[PDB]
Amino acid sequence: MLFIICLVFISCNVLREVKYQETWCFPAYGMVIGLWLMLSSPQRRLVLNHTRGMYHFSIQGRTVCQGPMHLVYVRLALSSDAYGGRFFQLVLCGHKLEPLVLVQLSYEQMEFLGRHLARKLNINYFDYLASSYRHVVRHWPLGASFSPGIVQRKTQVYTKS
C-alpha cells in the first residue's frame, strides 16, 4: 500500500503551502499527513521453493510463516457484485496472501503473464486452460491448516454435475 503513501504524501505537499484567506477554516490537513507515512511501512518478496514443494512467507528478510505446496494448482474465487456484475478474486492453495486477483477482469495480456508465471512457478493454471467463467479447482496442499475452508473450498467448487 505504498502507492497510498505515495498518494497521500503528495496531496499533503500540495496542501502544505496555500493561502485560504478565510475566517476560521484552520489549515489542519495534516491529519492526512500521518495517514501517508502510516501505510508506507518493508518490501514483500515471495519465493516458490518448488524443489521441495514448499512455500515460506517473509518480507524484508524476516520469516513469518511457511508451508508445503504438495498439491499445487491455480484457483480464483468468485467475488460477485450487488449489481448484476462479476468480479475476480484469486486465492491460491486456499491461503490468504496478497490478492493476485484478475485486475481489469471486466486482460488477455494480463492473463498471459500468469500462464508464463504459472509455468515459471511450475504449478497448474486451472483458470487459464479453460477461461470462460468461474472454473477453477483449488489445490489446497495438505501443509495448510484451513480445515473450515480447505474442505469447504471444494464445496464452492463445481464438480461439473
Binding site: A28, M31, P42, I59
Partner: protein
C-alpha cells in the same frame, strides 16, 4: 512469550493498528477537552479555548469512533477474547468523549463568536 516475540520481529495483524490508533486519539482528545473545560470553568477564562478548531476536533472524534469500529470487528472476527473485552470499551470509551465534547459545545454556544 511466543505472542510478543512474533510481532516484535515484524508488523501486526490489522485489528491492532487501527484500534490503538484510536487510543492515542482518545488521549490527544482527552487533553484538549480537559484544558477547554479547565479554562471554561476553573480559571474562568474564555480566550484560551477551542473555537479556532471546533471543526477539526469534532471531525477527528468521528474518525476516532469509526476507526474503533473497524478495528473492533477484526478482533471479534478473529475472536480473541482478550481483544474482545478490550476494544468494546474503546468503542464506548470514545463514545463517551463524543457525547461530552458535544455538551461542551452547546454550553459554550454564547461564548464562541457569531454566525447564525
Amino acid at each position: 512469550m511466543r505472542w510478543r516475540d512474533r510481532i516484535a520481529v515484524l508488523c501486526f495483524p490489522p485489528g491492532l493498528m487501527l484500534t490503538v490508533a484510536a487510543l492515542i486519539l482518545f488521549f490527544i482528545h482527552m487533553g484538549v477537552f480537559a484544558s477547554d473545560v479547565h479554562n471554561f470553568c476553573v480559571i474562568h477564562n474564555y480566550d484560551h479555548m477551542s473555537f479556532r478548531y471546533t471543526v477539526v476536533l469534532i471531525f477527528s472524534q468521528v474518525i476516532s469512533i469509526g476507526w474503533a469500529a473497524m478495528g473492533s470487528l477484526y478482533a471479534e472476527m478473529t475472536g480473541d477474547k482478550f481483544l474482545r473485552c478490550f476494544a468494546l470499551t474503546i468503542l464506548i470509551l470514545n463514545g463517551a468523549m463524543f457525547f461530552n465534547r458535544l455538551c461542551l459545545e452547546f454550553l459554550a454556544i454564547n461564548y464562541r463568536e457569531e454566525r447564525h
